[PDB]
A paper describes a structure:
The OsXIP structure was refined to Rwork/Rfree of 16.6%/17.9% at a resolution of 1.30 Å and shown to adopt a (β/α)8-barrel fold, as observed in family GH18 chitinase structures. Electron density maps of the amino acid residues (Arg155-Val158) consisting of a part of the loop between α4 and β5 (Lα4β5OsXIP) were unobservable in the structure. Although OsXIP shares only 38.2% and 27.6% sequence identity, respectively, with XIP-I and hevamine, a GH18 chitinase from rubber tree Hevea brasiliensis, the main chain structure of OsXIP was closely similar to those of XIP-I and hevamine with RMSDs of 0.85 and 0.77 Å for the corresponding 260 and 253 Cα atoms, respectively. However, in the OsXIP structure, these amino acid residues were substituted, that is, Gln9→Arg18, Asn34→Ser43, Asn45→Asp55, Gly81→Gln85, Ile82→Gly86, Asp125→Phe131, Glu127→Asp133, Tyr183→Phe192, Ala224→Val228, and Trp255→Trp258, respectively, and the substitutions appeared to have caused the protein to lose binding ability of allosamidin. The catalytic signature motif, DxDxE, conserved in GH18 chitinases, was found in center of the groove of hevamine, but not in the structure of OsXIP. In most GH18 chitinases, three disulfide bonds (SS1, SS2, and SS3) are conserved; however, only the two disulfide bonds corresponding to SS1 and SS3 of hevamine are formed in the structure of OsXIP. In particular, the loop between α4 and β5 extruded from the opposite side of the DxDxE catalytic site in hevamine (Lα4β5hev, magenta) consisting of only four amino acid residues (Gly148-Val151), while the corresponding loop in OsXIP (Lα4β5OsXIP) was made of eight amino acid residues (Asp153-Val160) (brown). Although OsXIP possessed Arg155 at the corresponding position, electron density maps of the residues making up a part of Lα4β5OsXIP (Arg155-Val158) were not observed, indicating Lα4β5OsXIP being more conformationally flexible than Lα4β5XIP-I. Furthermore XIP-I has Lys234 in helix α7 (light green), which forms a salt bridge with the acid-base catalyst Glu131 and water-mediated hydrogen bond with the nucleophile Glu239 of XLNC, a GH10 xylanase from A. nidulans, to inhibit its catalytic activity.
Plants have evolved xylanase inhibitor proteins as part of their defense mechanisms against phytopathogens. The rice xylanase inhibitor protein (OsXIP) is structurally similar to GH18 chitinase and homologous to wheat XIP-type inhibitor (XIP-I), which inhibits both GH10 and GH11 xylanases. Various inhibition and interaction analyses showed that OsXIP competitively inhibits the hydrolytic activity of GH11 xylanase RXyn2, but not the activity of GH10 xylanase RXyn1 from Rhizopus oryzae. Although XIP-type inhibitors share significant sequence similarity with GH18 chitinases and adopt a (β/α)8-barrel fold, they are thought to be devoid of chitinase activity because of lack of the catalytic DxDxE motif, which is completely conserved in the catalytic domains of GH18 chitinases.
Residue numbers in the entry: 6 to 153, 159 to 272
Write the structure that this text describes.
Amino acid sequence: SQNTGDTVIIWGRNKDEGSLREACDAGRYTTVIISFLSAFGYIPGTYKLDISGHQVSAVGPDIKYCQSKGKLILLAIGGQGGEYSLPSSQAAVDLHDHLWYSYLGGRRNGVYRPFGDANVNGIDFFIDQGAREHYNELAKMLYDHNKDGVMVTATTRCGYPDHRLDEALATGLFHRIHVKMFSDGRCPAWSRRQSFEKWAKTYPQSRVLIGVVASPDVDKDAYMPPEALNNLLQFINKQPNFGGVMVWDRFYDKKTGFTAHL
C-alpha cells in the first residue's frame, strides 16, 4: 500500500473491541496506543485510567505477549475529556512520578500498577483538552530516563501549530507525532496534504504519522476511505520522516476492516 511506515491503532475506547492480545494477533498493527489516562493535575493525588471497562487484569499479560511478538505499546495521557491539565510544575512532577512508577519501568512497593509487572514502551501526549502549560517539563522528565527505553510521542490536532503541544514539541524530545485529520480542529479536506507536510517539515527529527478514522461513524467529515487515503499517501509518503498511519480505533477498524483494505 502507500503506507510505507508503521500502523498504529488506538485501543481502550470500547470494551467490545476485544482484548489487547487480539489486536496484536490481528496481523495489522505495529503499535497499540492504550487510551487514556484521562484524569490528572486538577486534584493532587487523583489519577484515573479510563479504558472503557476493559479488564485491567488482562492488559499486563497481553502487553508482555504483544512485546514478545515485536509490537510497541504506548499509554496515552489526556484524551477528549475535561478531567485533566497541569496547573503547576509540581503537577507535572507528580504526573511524571505516577507514570514512571505505575506504568513505565519504575518500581515502588505500594504503588498500584494496573498492568502489573508489564512496562509500556512509552507515553503518547494526547493533549486534546485542558491548558497547555508544563507538558514541556513532563516531556523532559520522561525523556530523561533514556539518558538515565521511554518513547515520547504526541497526538496533535490537524492544524499546525497545536498550541496544546507546541511548547512540548519545541523541546525536541518527541520521537513520533501523530497528526489527527479527524476530531475537533479537523482540517478541511482540501488542506490535508499541505497541513501534514507542514508538520512533517517542521519536525524533521521526528517520525510524523497521519491520524485517520476507520469509519465515518467516528467522524463523517474527516473519514477518507482506503482508496482516498492511499491517494493522499502517495504524496505525503515522500516526506523523508513520514512515519506511517495512526488509526482511530480498534473497535471501528474491526468493524470496517479499514487497515486490512489499505
